[PDB]
Amino acid sequence: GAEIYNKDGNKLDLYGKIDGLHYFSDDKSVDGDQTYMRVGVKGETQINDQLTGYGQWEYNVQANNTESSSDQAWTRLAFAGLKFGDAGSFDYGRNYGVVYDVTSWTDVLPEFGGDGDTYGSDNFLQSRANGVATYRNSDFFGLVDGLNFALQYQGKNGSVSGEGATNNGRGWSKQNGDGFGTSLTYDIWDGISAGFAYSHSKRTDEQNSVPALGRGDNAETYTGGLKYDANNIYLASQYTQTYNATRAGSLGFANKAQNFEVVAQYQFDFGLRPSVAYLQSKGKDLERGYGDQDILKYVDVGATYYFNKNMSTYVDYKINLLDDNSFTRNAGISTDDVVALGLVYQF
Amino acid sequence: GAEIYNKDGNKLDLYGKIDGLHYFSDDKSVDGDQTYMRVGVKGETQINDQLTGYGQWEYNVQANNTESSSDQAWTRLAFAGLKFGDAGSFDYGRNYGVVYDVTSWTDVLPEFGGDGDTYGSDNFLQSRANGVATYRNSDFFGLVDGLNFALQYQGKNGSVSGEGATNNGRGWSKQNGDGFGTSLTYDIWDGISAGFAYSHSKRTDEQNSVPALGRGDNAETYTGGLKYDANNIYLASQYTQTYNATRAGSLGFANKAQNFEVVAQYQFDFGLRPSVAYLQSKGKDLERGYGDQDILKYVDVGATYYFNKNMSTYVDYKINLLDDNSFTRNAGISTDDVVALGLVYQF
Amino acid sequence: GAEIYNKDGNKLDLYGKIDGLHYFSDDKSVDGDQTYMRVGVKGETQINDQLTGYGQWEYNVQANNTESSSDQAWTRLAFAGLKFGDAGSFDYGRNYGVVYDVTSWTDVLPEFGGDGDTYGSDNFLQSRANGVATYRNSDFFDGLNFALQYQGKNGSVSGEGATNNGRGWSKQNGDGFGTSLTYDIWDGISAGFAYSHSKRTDEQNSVPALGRGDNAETYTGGLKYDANNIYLASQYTQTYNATRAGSLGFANKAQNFEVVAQYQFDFGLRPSVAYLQSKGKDLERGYGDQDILKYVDVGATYYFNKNMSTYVDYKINLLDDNSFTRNAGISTDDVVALGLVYQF
Known part of the structure; x- marks a missing residue:
């Protein structure tokens, strides 16, 4: 929210949040203060009756380290585009890869879930990505209501130096x-939705030489998802099968992986919203004797209290089900539980 | 100032400054261009009759180095809170330690003084800090006008790795x-105020093992201060005794230290505001032969001319009274004088 | 620029752009995604009838690397100032060196050109610079603009x-x-001259192999035609110890020429052709005379409206690949850019 300019067919929207957040955990790389903020601008300009131009920027600013610390801010989103009425839209920039058009349905936990779990940022077309051109079509050319599809291309983002x-x-x-x-989503009834997404990317020579884990010329994802959202109930699931595309922690990629997320939520009228969820990532055919391994496995329980559209508070409890083994230690995968408390101002 | 949004019980205040600033000094680490700017956002949301939610972000951006330089921007403040009428307020994030509720009374010099002098940032609860939970009460529940207090907790902020x-x-x-x-301030008249603050923090293992100077499990500060602010006159003093809390330059902490600051100012009607001040920090029982040492000692004379509420210019002259000795050289403590010239736009 | 505040004699203008930009080139350090944005604030406060205060900040934020990459944002401008009616102005901070009052006339290509080419940022008073005090005067106490500018030493990280x-x-x-001087001789036709003199530093005369001398100097003259939907401009600059010989140092002397022709069609298309070169002279290590920069530029911008545009730009590199260009890391490959831009 927060329209700070609207004049002569041009609109500017300033948005963001300040999230005062603490984590409690035996895992010392996660435990402690996690306060951060986000700030963004969504801009829109009417060009003619059939054509609108637009841009969007979103910046993450950590506030949990010192004034002399390094690398505390980064761009999440930065893209410019054209909207051609109901012929569709085109934008280029740092934007979400289309796979998240489906997996976003389960990215609704009070604090955990989303990127960092079964997928990450800068992870082919699974989340936010450098250099994506994205075509989007609404209601299949104004013909089939509730049917959306998208087509996406990403140019090579390669090594620092060398070939x-x-x-x-x-x-x-x-x-x-x-x-x-490519992604496709359909509202079969009101409240109920189904969705598919596919992606295919070349891998780089560094991905096939530097890490010990993961080999192949191509990275692929196949995703299906379901969503119920009505009568104060929210249910969603996402199943995704990947080839050479899921990070096996710091050790490389999984030759194959199966990812599953499911979540259930209820919104009470007075503002409380409890949440339960399950997330797993199963890696297959890992080199160096790792074989089949759990990459991620946890149950999540929590709640968010909404004071209003501008302020909320929340707790989230990640109940970690991974067994500590040599894979989890060498790959840097946390096996500890975590509680999160947060108080959020949004604009 | 600068309210850019005020609609449906939500307001947004965009504030900051652009400070065109040059230092003249024989100290080569201080001398030269010091231009920088500050930008921030104060946001407030009415939730109900008795409850207001809020947050605030403040960013510092250096402009005195090149476009390829590193680490030129950082967060000063990021916190979110709730205000419950006269039962008090609570906020969590990066915020001021409560000690500064008193020592701020002497942080009014044209340019010098404040953090970097007798205390610094990320220095226990003496100034801006990560991960402080702060309860504040003004006018003692509405019952005693001018009586304010604060209670504050801070979680551990530890090493990069290890135990x-x-x-x-x-x-x-x-x-x-x-x-x-904890802090406590009382307005005896509407110009005269007294105040006390106390803090107690656990020291970390690295503070006792890496630097040469300062040993102890606990850091403690005791601060008393006085203030006269009316009839265009400003007099303020602050006395603070510390234990394992005051930095001995780069060499560690002073096992105990005494800090004193005093300042007098006068505001002419045409906008000129002269300032004289005195600041010192005396360290005691330092290891490695140092014994008692001056950490900071100087007299300050300067003036600010206010063109209006949005634009000022200033000179400040730090007459440094430290002897150049083995301690000051080894601790990286400046012993040279400094002149500052500035032109400031504020919004 | 979007005026987001104007009350009680104080105005605040928010401005910037999002530039969705891709480069294509055999030079792998140039090729790829180049998306970035810029954001700034222009502020003005009325003080009295004869005095206005102002400040401006402009920030660059790269969006073409990851969320763990480093050094992806930097300040381009940050300065505060006073304007004394029409009798001119003064400002201090990070701002454009006055040489750019004239070279800005050729800095109008769709994408290429400007800083990075014949001169750079943080390059004495040729472009953006830290710590410049700038006095400017309109109508020389008529239509004749004068500037005088001082810059304090910006020196080494440590040492002397x-x-x-x-x-x-x-x-x-x-x-x-x-100092700079510009004049509108006819309506549409402008001429301009600029001079700068700066002390060099000990590191500049000891660490790089190329460029020796106590002083850096620039002499610049420039012409501009800007009427009847036509834009022509040229810039000729001579430098001593002031132009960069890539990573190897500075050129003891150099001659930089920039010229550009453009036309602005009513329906929003704006074709552009330009030529840029930088000729270095009297280089150490046996280099002698050497091309530092040489290329023809063709491209076009389509303006949907004042807030949205698309563009192509084609850098036809004419440098020969030799020992100087390799050692100094000067690119000799061509570049094509495609972009889509939202501006506020």
Whole structure:
């Protein structure tokens, strides 16, 4: 919310939040203060009757470290686009890959869930990504109400230097080759929705040489999801099968992985919203003797109290079901439980 | 000021400044361009008759280095809270330690003084800190006009890794253990005020093992202060005794220290505001032969001309009274004088 | 620019852009996604009848790398000032060196051109610079704009030559000054001259192999035609110890020429052609004379309206790949850019 400018067919929306947040956990890399804020601008300009231009920026600013600390802020989203009425829309920038058009349905926990769990950011087209061109079509050309599809292309984001480089190089875990993806979602009834998404990306030579885990020329995802949202009830599930595309912690990628998320929530009238969820990620055919391994496994219980549209408080309890083993230690995968308390101002 | 949004019980205040600033000094680490700007947002949401929610963010952006330089921006404040009428308020985030509810009375110099002098930031509850929970009460529940108090808790902010670590680790000089603090201020008249503050924090293992100077399990501060602010006159003093809490430059902490600051100012009607001040920090029982040492000692003379509420210019002259000795050289403590010239736009 | 506040003689203007931008090139350090945005504030406060105060901040934020990448944002402008009626103005902070009052006339390509090409940022008083005090005057106490500018030393990180805000030798400067003069001879036709003189630093005369001298200097002259939907402009600049010879140092002398032609169609298309070169002279290590920069530029911008545009730009690199270009890390490959831009 927060329209700070609306004049002569041009609109500007300032949005964000300040999330005062603490984690409690035996895992010392997670435990402690997690206060952060987000700030963003959504902009819109009417060009003619049939054509609207738009842009959006969203910035994450950590506030949990010192004034001399490093790397405390980063861009989540930055894209510009055109909306052609009901012929669709096109934008290019740092945006969400289309797979999240479906997996977002289970990304509604009070605090945990979403990117960092069964998938991450800069993880092919599974979450936020550098350099995505995205075509979106609403209601199948104004014909079939509730039917949305999207087509997406991502250019190579390669190594810092050497043969595989681009200008915007990173480490292997956040690299991609050329890739594409597609999503499709349908509101079969009101309240009920189904969705599919697919993605295919080339992998880079660094991804196939530097880490010990994961080999193949191509990274692929296949996703199906369901969602019930009505009568103060929210149910959703997401099942995703991946090839060479799911991080096996710090050790590389899983040659194959199966990811599952399900969540159930109720919204009481006085503002309380309890939540229970289950998330797992099962990795298959890992090298170096790892074989089949749990990448992620937890039950999640929590609640959010909404004071109003601008202020809320919440607790979330991640009940970790992973067994501590040599895979979890070497890959840096947490096996401890975590409680989160937070107080949030939003604008 | 600058209310850019006020609609349906939600308001948003965009504030900050642009400070065109040059230092002149024989100290090469201080001398030269010091231009920087501050930007922030104060937000408030009415929830119900008795309850208001709020948050606040403040960012510091250096502009005195190049476009390829590192670490030029950081968060000063980020916190969210609830105000329950005269039963008090609560907020959590990066915020001011309650000790500063008193020492702030002397932090009114044209340019110098404040953090970096007798205390710093991320320095237990002496200034801005990570992860403080702060309960405040004004006018003692509405029953005693001018009587304010605060109770504050701070979670451990530990090492980058090892046994003593938290998620948001930093170096020993900005670490803290679990700690609390309290403050109390009373307006005897509407210009004259007295105040006290206390804090107690656990020290971390790195604070006792890495630096040469300062040993103890606990950090403690006792602060009393006085203030006269009326009839265009401003007199203020603050006295603070510390234990294992005051930085001995880069060498560690002073086992005990005494800090004194006093300042007098006068506001002319045409907008000129002269200022004289005196500041010192005397460290005691330092290890390695140092014994008693001056940590800070200087006289300050300067003036601010206010063109209006949005624009000012100022000079400030720090006449440094430290002897250049082995302690000051080894601790990285400046012994040179400094002149500052500034032009400031504020919104 | 969007006026988000205007009350009681104080105005606040929020401005910026989101630039969805892709580069294509065989030069792998240039090729790929280049999406970035800029955000700024222009503030103005009325003080009295003869005096206004103001400040401006402009921030660059890259959006083409990951959420764990580092050094992805930096301040381009940050300055506060006073304007004394029409009798001119003064400001201090990070701002444009006065040389750009003239070279800005050729900095109008769809994408390429400007800082990074014949001159750079933090490059004495040629572009954006830390710690500039700038006095400006309209109508020379008529239509004749004058500026005088001083810059304090910005020196090394540590050692003899240090200041608080130390940096590498390529972006250092000593105490310096500059002056500019521009005039509208006819309506549409402008001419301009600019001079700068700065002390070099000890690191600039000791760490890089190229460029020796106590002082850096620039002489610039420029012309501009801007009427009847036509835009022509040129810039000729001579420099001593002031132009960068890539990563190797500075050029003892250099000659930089920039020229551009453009036309603005009513329906919003704006084709552009331009030529840029930088000729370095008297280089150490046997380099002698060398091209530092040489290319033709063709492209176009389509403006949907004042807030949205798309563009293509094609850099036709004419440099020959030789020992100087390789050692100094100067690109000799072509570049194509495609972008879509939202502006507020």
